[PDB]
Amino acid sequence: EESRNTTVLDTTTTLQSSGFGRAFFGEAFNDLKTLMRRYQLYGQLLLSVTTDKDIDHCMFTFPCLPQGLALDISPHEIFNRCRDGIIPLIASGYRFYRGDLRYKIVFPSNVNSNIWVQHRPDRRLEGWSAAKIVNCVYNHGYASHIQITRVNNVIELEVPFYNATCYNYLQAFNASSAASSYAVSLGEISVGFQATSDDIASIVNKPVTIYYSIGDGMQFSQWVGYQPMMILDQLPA
Amino acid sequence: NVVLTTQRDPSTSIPAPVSVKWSRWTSNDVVDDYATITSRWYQIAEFVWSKDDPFDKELARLILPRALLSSIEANSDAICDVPNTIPFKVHAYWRGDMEVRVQINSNKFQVGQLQATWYYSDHENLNISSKRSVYGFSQMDHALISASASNEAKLVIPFKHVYPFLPTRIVPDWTTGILDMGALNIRVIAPLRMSATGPTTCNVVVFIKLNNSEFTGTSSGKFYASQIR
Amino acid sequence: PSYQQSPRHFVPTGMHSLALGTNLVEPLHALRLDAAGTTQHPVGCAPDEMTVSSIASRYGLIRRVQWKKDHAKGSLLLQLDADPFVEQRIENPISLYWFAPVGVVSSMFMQWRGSLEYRFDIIASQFHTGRLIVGYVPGLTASLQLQMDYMKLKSSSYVVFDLQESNSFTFEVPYVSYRPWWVRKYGGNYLPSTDAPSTLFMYVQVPLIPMEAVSDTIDINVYVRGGSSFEVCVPVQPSLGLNWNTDFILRNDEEYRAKTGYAPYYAGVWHSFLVRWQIAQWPTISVPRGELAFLRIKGTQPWRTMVWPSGHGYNIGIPTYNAERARAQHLYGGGSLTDEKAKQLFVPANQQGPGKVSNGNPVWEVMRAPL
């Protein structure tokens, strides 16, 4: 058995527990779930106008998942340098998950146009490749929200759990079973603008950052051990 | 009617608690228990383990609802000859909790230690090729077989998958990955260390009981394709 | 009714907090259909597991120690550090490592404290007889990593074990330090920021005397589990990354790129000036006095040749038909862009073509030539 204990040979007196930092710093940390709701960068993109897009056109689409994206490293100096952050490092330790996610997408300053954002639980995830942000229409019955840039250029979201599942896969997904692609992402969030073709040209090569966190609904399943790790100071200068 | 014994006390490592029957949410067909016939034990993999197998080496990546059938269709007969598995031939959709014993019959003078580990949905990950090692599967709960005392590894494995039913044949929403729950993988930790005049062989037998199964969706047995080799 | 009472007097801010993850009501824009809706867990879908001490109470296999017959009565078996950060190296230009679960969940925090129960599982028959110290010295630096043996070990805290009919024991490594916590050994990618508080040692006190029917060598497995008093406090940048994507990109400078927010570019026209992203910037090539520079990469044609200050505060890269028109002798030789010599060397506007853009930020090659 793993967690057995054959013969304790303790030398120690009993340590005063700090209560996981509650005694010093005034706050507990034993519950890792309350750390998980600290926001982490999800994926940063650069806008790129390909066609003279219609107002209906989504500017970028991305699947929505707590696993962390297919990591897209002119490299992005964070994903070149600060590997993975926190939440996929914890999410490596659990085979499944079930629960909500929060997003809080942040938009640049020079944009002014109105922003529509969709949740699409119809969309599956086909393989770990093309499970990243994709620079590409607006739809009716999908769950929608418009943030106005002129009031505040940061939308926030509580994207719920819409799967017909007991829970969903949390490690990186190779798409073995064909219906299992329905059971990895929560769905697919799409961000599109109402900008016309003349004004969207100024917004080219502006960064659009997306954050994420779980938001109290997430409950991880069966334990799985960690994968092999890379030590970050060993990365070259 | 299959009764099996061991001389030594087991070392179970239950991964998850016992699950519900789950027949109320998605089956209106005759959901029939078969505890008189399917709860028999059945040998699915025996293999020779000698000292030439190195430290971090696989022995058998048994996929357990498949390997109950794969040992049958490997062993020169169809499903209708084994009374454990004829409800897989008739019915189309399966659920159920498994019991898995990994018996060893090592001599006492041998020194070695296998491990048995259940993992959920091995084939639904690509990164298990980085993980398929003793250090990864030690962190999750796992049974241990010491070849010194010839310990046995009983191993309760409750059914836990994303969808609450595993199909048994080609099904209109998935085909690949049929009746797959994950990997029972038997990784060596301590290899056989013996004298020059030592007993080299060490056979390992794996039995499986299938008790809280439910079968639903009765259909014709001519639809049931063979499992993959 | 007229509401003439004087109103509130606030402060706007643009974003809710990020590090706050606790008893704090967070307002959002839910894409759920229901306002009182919460994701739920039915009778089988209530998940089993999440807690730092739920991770820190799992053994992880961390060291294979060979233990032979002819190891002497003072031979070292491991000098490994008494932190949760236990070094286990797997044999890429970056290397990957196993860790204990308490090691990783320590590596997602700044500080740790408490005991560390290392389990020694000594795989042998009951015919082997052994004896070995598991000692523990608090506070040995790197220069004191030498001078170590069992005789100087037994001054400190130590546990002598007899390998017999029982073969396994979990020693509980104490937490002995001056500080209430202890800083993470590795930190971010940052060469300053500290070794272990204390060191474990394991010497063979009495060597293995096996029987002649069994083997001379014996495996010793060393597991690591966080102790019962283990606890971590401050959430910082993690020191460990996954191996889903082991790709790494260096940033030596002898390589070129377009400036940030100016790639991808395309060949086109500009009324102040072929030359765009609004003209795309380019880095200033570090040319000393008496040289010239031209570019060849690693419209109507692919533009494999291309730097001079535009006059509007940023550099421009002019496309040429070949490296001959590009080969900078005029401009570094004292000319200017308005020269007729320069205007003949330029590409005319008709070569704009359909104008397919470059793929991202294509790394050019900086050719430096004497003048």
Distances (CA, A) of A66 to A127, B115, C49: 16, 31, 17
Number of helices (H) and strands (E) in chain B: give both, helices first: 4, 11
Specify the residue for token string 């523990």. C136
A6 close contact with B: CB closer than 8 A: no
- Cα separation, A33 vs A93, whole angstroms: 13
Whether C169 and C45 map to the same domain: the answer is yes
Q: Which DSSP string corresponds to A32-61? A: SHHHHTS-EEEEEEE----S---TT-EEEE
Query: Please, is C65 exposed, middle or buried when counting C-beta atoms within 10 Å of its C-beta (0-12, 13-18, 19+)?
Result: middle
A2 close contact with B: CB closer than 8 A: yes
Whether C93 and C228 map to the same domain: the answer is yes
Strands A58-64 and A134-135, by their bridges, are antiparallel
Q: Which helix or strand (DSSP H or E) is residue C113 part of?
A: strand C111-113
Whether C217 and C251 map to the same domain: the answer is no
Name the domain boundary from C211, C246, C281: C246
Specify the residue for token string 């200033």. C284
User: Count of A–C CB contacts within 8 Å?
Assistant: 298
Domain containing residue B87 = 1-229
Query: Please, is A75 exposed, middle or buried when counting C-beta atoms within 10 Å of its C-beta (0-12, 13-18, 19+)?
Result: middle
- Contact residues, chain C, for B127 at CB < 8 Å: 243-244
Which residue, among C15, C17, C24, C31, would best test binding to A if mutated, counting the most A CBs under 10 Å from its CB? C31
Phi and psi dihedrals of A22, rounded to 5? -60, -35
B192 close contact with C: CB closer than 8 A: no
Q: Could you tell me the two tokens for C225?
A: 């589990």
- Cα separation, C81 vs C230, whole angstroms: 16
* Resolution, expressed in angstroms to one decimal: 4.8
Distances (CA, A) of B192 to B149, B206, B214, C349: 13, 19, 41, 78
Specify the residue for token string 């010839």. B150
Structurally, chain C folds into a number of domains equal to: 2
Q: How was this structure determined?
A: cryo-EM
Which residue, among C244, C260, C277, would best test binding to A if mutated, counting the most A CBs under 10 Å from its CB? C244
Name the domain boundary from C246, C261, C277: C246
- Cα separation, C95 vs A233, whole angstroms: 11
Whether C185 and C298 map to the same domain: the answer is no
Q: Could you tell me the two tokens for B65?
A: 């609802």
* B174·A223 Cβ contact <8 A: no
- Cα separation, A48 vs A201, whole angstroms: 9
- Cα separation, C361 vs C277, whole angstroms: 11
* A228·C18 Cβ contact <8 A: no
Domain containing residue C241 = 1-246
Q: Give the three-class secondary structure for B32.
A: strand
Structurally, chain B folds into a number of domains equal to: 1
Chains in contact with A via at least 3 Cβ–Cβ pairs below 8 Å = B, C
Q: Which of C265, C257, C337 is nearest to C298 (CA)?
A: C257
Phi and psi dihedrals of A205, rounded to 5? 60, 40
Residue B94: CB atoms within 10 A of its CB come to: 22
Amino acid letter, A138: Y
In this structure, are residues B93 and B167 in contact, taking their beta carbons and an 8 Å threshold? yes
- Cα separation, B116 vs A1, whole angstroms: 10
Measured in angstroms, the CA of B73 and the nearest CA of chain C are apart by 33
Q: Give the three-class secondary structure for C298.
A: coil
Q: Could you tell me the two tokens for A91?
A: 């999410």
Chain B residue with CA closest to C96: the answer is: B130
* Direct distance between the N- and C-terminal alpha carbons of chain C, in angstroms, rounded to an integer: 85
Q: Which of C72, C351, B103, C280 is nearest to A74 (CA)?
A: C280
- Cα separation, A221 vs A192, whole angstroms: 34
Whether C242 and C297 map to the same domain: the answer is no
Stretch 61-100 of chain A: residues touching chain B, C-beta under 8 Å: 95-96
Distances (CA, A) of C59 to A210, B168, C223: 36, 37, 6
- Cα separation, C349 vs C281, whole angstroms: 20
Amino acid letter, A52: D
Specify the residue for token string 């340590």. A15
Chains in contact with C via at least 3 Cβ–Cβ pairs below 8 Å = A, B
Chain A residue with CA closest to C249: the answer is: A80
Strands C198-209 and C76-78, by their bridges, are antiparallel
Whether C239 and C328 map to the same domain: the answer is no
Whether C159 and C282 map to the same domain: the answer is no
* B111·C223 Cβ contact <8 A: no
- Cα separation, B153 vs B144, whole angstroms: 6
Whether C193 and C265 map to the same domain: the answer is no
* C123·B113 Cβ contact <8 A: yes
Which residue, among A71, A167, A222, would best test binding to B if mutated, counting the most B CBs under 10 Å from its CB? A222
Q: Could you tell me the two tokens for C120?
A: 């020694």
Distances (CA, A) of C255 to C298, C365, C366: 10, 7, 8
Specify the residue for token string 């290899």. B191
User: Alpha carbon A125 to chain centroid distance?
Assistant: 14
Which residue, among C49, C68, C122, C123, would best test binding to B if mutated, counting the most B CBs under 10 Å from its CB? C123
Residue C359: CB atoms within 10 A of its CB come to: 8
Phi and psi dihedrals of C343, rounded to 5? -70, -25
Query: Please, is C321 exposed, middle or buried when counting C-beta atoms within 10 Å of its C-beta (0-12, 13-18, 19+)?
Result: middle
- Contact residues, chain A, for B137 at CB < 8 Å: 225
Contacts by C316-322, CB closer than 8 A, 24 or more apart:
C316/C273, C316/C275, C316/C279, C316/C280, C316/C281, C316/C282, C317/C275, C317/C280, C317/C282, C318/C274, C318/C275, C318/C346, C318/C347, C319/C267, C319/C274, C319/C275, C319/C347, C319/C351, C320/C345, C320/C346, C320/C347, C321/C347
Domain boundary assignment for chain A: 1-237
Name the domain boundary from C223, C246, C269: C246
Q: Which DSSP string corresponds to A152-214? A: -SB---EE----SSS-EE-S-----STGGGGGSSSEEEEEEE---TTTTTTTTT-EEEEEEB-
